[PDB]
Amino acid sequence: KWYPAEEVPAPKQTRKAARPQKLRASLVPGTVLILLAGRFRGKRVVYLKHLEDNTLLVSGPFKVNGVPLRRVNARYVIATSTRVSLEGVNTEKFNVAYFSREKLSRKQRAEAQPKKEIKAERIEDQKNIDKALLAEIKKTPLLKQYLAATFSLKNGDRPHLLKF
Amino acid sequence: SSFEPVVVIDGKGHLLGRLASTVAKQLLNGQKIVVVRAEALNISGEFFRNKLKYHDYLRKATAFNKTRGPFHFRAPSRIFYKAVRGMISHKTARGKAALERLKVFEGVPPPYDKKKRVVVPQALRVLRLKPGRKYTTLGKLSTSVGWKYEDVVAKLEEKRKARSAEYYLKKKAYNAVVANKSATVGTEVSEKLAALGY
Amino acid sequence: RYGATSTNPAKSASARGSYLRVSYKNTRETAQAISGWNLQKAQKYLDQVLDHQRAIPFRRFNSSIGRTAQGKEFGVTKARWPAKSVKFVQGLLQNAASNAEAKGLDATRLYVSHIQVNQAPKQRRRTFRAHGRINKYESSPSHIELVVTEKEEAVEKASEKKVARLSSRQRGRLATQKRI
Amino acid sequence: AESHRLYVKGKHLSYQRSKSVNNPNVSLVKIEGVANPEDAKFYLGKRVAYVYRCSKEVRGSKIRVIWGKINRTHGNSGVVRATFRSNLPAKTFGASVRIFLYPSN
Amino acid sequence: LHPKIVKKHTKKFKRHHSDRYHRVSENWRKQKGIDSVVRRRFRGNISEPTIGYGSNKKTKFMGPDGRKVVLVSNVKGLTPLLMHTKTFAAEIAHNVSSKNRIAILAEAKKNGIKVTNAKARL
RNA sequence: ACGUGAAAUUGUUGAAAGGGAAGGGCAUUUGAUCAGACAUGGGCCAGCAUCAGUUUUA
RNA sequence: CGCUCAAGCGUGUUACCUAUACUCCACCGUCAGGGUUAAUAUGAUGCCCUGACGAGUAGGCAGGCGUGGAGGUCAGUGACGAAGCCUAGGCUGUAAAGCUGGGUAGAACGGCCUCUAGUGCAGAUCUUGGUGGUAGUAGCAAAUAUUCAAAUGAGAACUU
RNA sequence: UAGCGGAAAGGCUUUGGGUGCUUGCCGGCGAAUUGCAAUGUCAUUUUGCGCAAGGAUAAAUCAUUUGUAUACGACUUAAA
Structure with missing residues (x-):
């Protein structure tokens, strides 16, 4: 008798704006971030720029600790x-399209060899930012050693009391 | 307020129900313990009384075949063990799971002595009971009702002490020093800073 | 025909015996003592039971049976020497052995694989109790069957594999550890 | 060097319950060195994960996890109500559980 | 966007003392007792079937596919479900012969109609 | 002791549990097993952001 | 259980735990109050909107599920396997129940619209038939008594 | 190399040799792609599998027998 119509949901005009992050x-x-x-x-790492997908562009010099x-x-x-001053650093060219990528069909396995496929643009751009920050970091004592070491909780340390 | 592999408590000066009242709660929290010197747990009341609140527990038993009736242990250790396996629903895995975590001795056996033990304030005849009352010293009691070792566990609880005195003294000289010098030595600049770093 | 077996049919022999007039409870105890033994071992054991050296352990059907010292072999107190139960079982083994000889199988490797004894239709017969009351007096006959097999080695081995699966971040953990 | 711990230790105490009847959908959790409600409010809306091992390998590992989070305080002794994605075994009363530091401020 | 199905109470309503005594089957039957606790609703006892457990009107008589099943015995019985593939699925009967299943399954796959069974013996 | 050959009730093999009975309801975990639209050229499980409805805590 | 400036007695001041109760949202059913084929495909018995309520023995009314036969109708299903029976397989319905995979087996049987009744069982010290635990247990003890060889026979405490 | 420790000692100091690391203070290379989080697997028990070194070379029951025992088991004796 009935056998429903194969027409479709075409949904109500929504009212939800895309306002920016606060x-x-x-x-x-x-x-400095942890x-x-x-x-x-x-x-331990260094904060540089706020990106436009609500993420943080972060270096923490590659020569210091390998990040x-x-x-x-x-x-x-x-x-x-x-904190450290970033007056001798560019960080203008970096955007969301800079971190774009082709996710691979799919594929796996035997040795899905992989020590390969890094851009010379990415290697050279790493050197420029690390050189500017290291000149700034060498002003204050014991900062280079602070970024090298890791953060780990001890017996006695209660996170709710600490300042960080 | 922190978790450890084990926690050794030294009764003495400690009451009973109030101590037992804690020793238990813990367990129900995957903890552990191991009371000692039980032969020194204090109990409110004038010696006499108590012994009555006993001679009455001792006159309670099956009628047609004791054997299977209420088993009245005499030795202390087990006593401060009863006042507990009664504060727990000890008829459900969980219960057992809890008692296996426990252990109580009258005296101080090896697998410890060489370890630091603690007390449990909220329960020490001196922070509670008012001054001018009367308290019974378990052991002594037990005796008058069984337990034939209130003279052995005493002849030993000595072979120990006597020594602990030595271990000490030896633990002053070495320290009466590791402190002496930390006096001159670079006790400078590096402090005029760490003394502030704090 | 034949109960739930799980062995090689080509290297096997069998023998039945339907509507036998023996105790169903006693024949079960004889058929469980023999089970899982070598064929030549069994025929000596059943002869020793008749002459009172060894004994049959009564495990299931054993209410109000007396104790005996011969039961210590198996680790059970109660045991008996049922004559009539053994003579029927001893007969079926010699039939099953001759069936294997016809096929051309080795006697030394031959062992009892499967054995079973379920109930039969009861023969009915009456008695006279006090105050003119008539009760039954029935028999409890048996349906015996057994199977013998050439015993051999190398039975599993076995079996499953994996065809593995893992995520990209889980795959990436293996990449670094091979380098280091 | 020695310690690599980025979480606070705790213990799963019991379910939400009355004298007789209980409700296994909500769990009660203890935290190290948290004796008040005011101190326990730091740990609200923080992710919690119970860990346990097995014999069989499910997906290239012998460790399985049940995720969850904290909702609100419970009583005047720093005890905390906690919900999970799936509820806990009940044998886990008095077992270790990890309170992480993310959704941070 | 099709409404997600929620079954409310998936556990089967068994009759009281179905497991206890052999003669009492597992088909549901209301207790008409005076001492009975199942009728009066006591704490820690079996549940009873009630209108509150009823399913949603949007998604009633729909399986995991989101399709209402129709029973088919022949090729001429497939002609109601020609322009209703997303809404109505099919199922071939038990009494149909082996060769006649191949006749129905052939013309069923032409029009793009999903059959629950078949599979098809093989 | 002959078409089909149910249940009570029994034997064998396989799997599981068992400290004064078993057997149920709510909720998980582990062990077993099972349905369901990533196929065309060669849906399931989460995370963050800005909003709406109801609340809680400084 | 244990408790003694209490974990006791009288009184005050705050926090906190918690019922199928109260507030708010999702879904089900029942009842009421409306709106609509003005060609405008598919059930006017339709298709929507808004608001309230839900315990229940004895009792009354309503709407459905199944069993055996009768009239109609799907030119329904079937020796290429109908009915019945077994299944820690699956799907739908709140439920009565229905549909379907695998095995066994070998002649008939289903859906939809109506008619009709010797039409649904756990109880009755219910009726007839079958089978358990109890249990390889109770027991097979009154009339004085049996023993040794030989033979027959597959086999002899019991026959000659 | 020395000694201490019987309450459940199964552990504590201790002479010396040999062999690494040393953030006590300065250097020079490396890490990226696990792609914006997904415990990201680093413990500790038992266990029997085959290796290859070192080491040793038996008893108890049943049947028979006894009476200091005995409902039947058990117990007590003897026997190359």
């Missing part, structure tokens, strides 16, 4: 008190 006051360009989650967990130019989510990071 970041917390602790994060300001130049601030990475909580991910591959480089508990690794490259990388995206980071703001909720999975701590903001410490220390």
Whole structure:
């Protein structure tokens, strides 16, 4: 009898605007951060630029501790008190399209060899930023050693009391 | 307020129900313990009384075949063990799982002595009970009702002490020094800073 | 025909015996003592039971049976020497052995693989109790069967594999550890 | 060097319950050195993960995890209500659980 | 965007003392007792079927596919479901012969109509 | 002791549990097993951001 | 259990735990109050909107599920396998139940619209038939008594 | 190399040799792509599998027998 019509949902005109992010006051360009989650967990790093997909452009000089130019989510990071000046650094060319990528069909396996396929643009751009920051970092004592070491909780340390 | 592989408590000066009241709670939290010197747990009341609140527990038992009736242990250790396996629903895995975490001795056996033990304030005849009352010293009690070792566990609890005195003294000289010198030596600049760093 | 077996049919022999007038409870205890033994071992054991050296352990059907010292072999107190139960089972083994000889199988490797004894239709017969009451007096006959097999080595081995699966970030963990 | 711990230790105490009846959808969690409600409010809305091992290898590993989070405080002794993606075994009463530091401020 | 199905109560309503006594089957039957606790609803006992457990009107008589099943015994019985592939799935009967399944399954796959069974013996 | 050959009830093999009974309801975990649209040229499980409805805590 | 400036008795001041109760949202059903084929495909019994309520023995009414036969209709299904039976396989319905994979087996049987009844069982010290635990247990003890060889026979405490 | 420790000692100091690292203070190379988080697997038990070194070379039951025992088991004796 009925056998429903194969017409379709065509949905109501929604009312949800895309307003920009309001970041917390602790994060300001130049601030040292502690990475909580991910591959480089508990690794001290440097904040550079706010990107336009609500992520943080983060270096933490590759020559010091081996952490490259990388995206980071703001909720999975701590903001410490220390800062460094970024007046002799560019960070204009970097955008969301800079970190674009072709996800590969798919594929796996035998040795899905992989020590390959890094751009010369990415290697040279790493050298320019690291050279500017190291001149700034060598002003204050014991900062180069601070970024090298990792963060780990001790017996007695209660996170709710600490300042960071 | 921190977790450890084990926690050794030194009864003495400690009451009973109030101590037992804690020793238990813990367990229900995958902890551990190992009371000692039980032969020194204090109990509110005038010696006499108590012994009555006992001679009555001792006159409670099956009628048609004791053997299977309430087993009245005499030795202390087990006592401060009863006042507990009664504060726990000890008829459900969880219960057991809890008692296996425990252990109580009257005296101080090896697998410890060489370890630091602690007290549990909220329960020390001196922070509670008012001054001018009367408290019974377990052991002594037990005796008058069984337990034939209130003279052995005493002849030993000595072969120990006597020594602990030595270990000490030796632990002053070495320290009466490791402190002496930290007096001159670079006790400078590096402090005029660390003294502030704090 | 034949109960739930799980062995090679080509290297096997069998023998049945339906509507036998023996105790169903006693024949079960004889058929479980013999089970899992070598064929030549068994025929000597059943002869020793008749002459009172060895004994049959009564495990399941054993209420109000007396104790005996011969039961210590198996680790059970109660045991008996059922004559009539053994003579029927001893007969079926000699039939099953001759069946294997016809096929051309080795006697030394031959062992009892499967054995079973379920109930039969009961023969009915009456008695006279007090105050003119008639009760039954029935028999409990048996349906015996057994299977013998050429015993051999190398039974599993076996079996499963994997065809593995893991994520990209989980794959990436292996890449670094091979380098270091 | 020695320690690599980026989480706070804790213990799964019990379910939300009355005298007799209980509710296994909400769990109660203890935290190290948290004696008040005011101190425990630091740990609200933080991710929590129970860890346990197995014999069989499911997906190239012998460790399985049940994710969850903290909702609100419970009582006047720093005890915390906690929800999980799937509820916990009940044998886990008095077992270790990891309180992470993300969704941070 | 099709509404996601929620079954409310997936566990089967068994009759009281179905496992206890053999003669009492597992088909549901209301207790008409006076001492009975299942009728009066006591804490820690079996549930009873009630209108509150009923499914949503948007997604009633739909499987995991989101399709209402129709029973088919022949090729001429497939002609109601020609322009209704997304809404109505098919299922071939138990009494149909082996060769006649191949006749229905051939012309079913032409029009793009999903059959629940078949599979098809093989 | 002959078409089909159900249940009570029994034997064998396989799997599981068992400290004064078993057997149920709510919720997980582990062990087993099972449905369901990534096929064309060669959906399931989460994370962050800005909003709406109801609340809580400084 | 244990408790003694209490974990006791009288009184005050705050926090906190918690019912199927109260507030808010999702879905189900029942009842009421409306709006609409003005050609405008598919059920006017339709297709939508808004608001309230939900315990229940004895009892009454309503709407459905199944069993055996009768009239109609799908030119329904079937020896290339109908009915029945077994299945820690699957899907739908709140449920009564229905549909379907695998095995066994070998002649008939289903859906939809109506008619009709010897039409649904757990109880009745229910009726007839079958089988358990109890249990290889109770027991097979009154009339004085049996023993040794030989023969027959597959086999002899019991026959000659 | 020395000694201490019987309460459940199964652990504590201790002479000396040999062999690494040393963030006590300065240097020079390396890490990227696990792609914006997904415990990201670093413990500790048992266990029997084959290796290859070192080491040793038995008893108890049943049947028979006894009466200091004995409902039947058990117990007590003897026997190359």
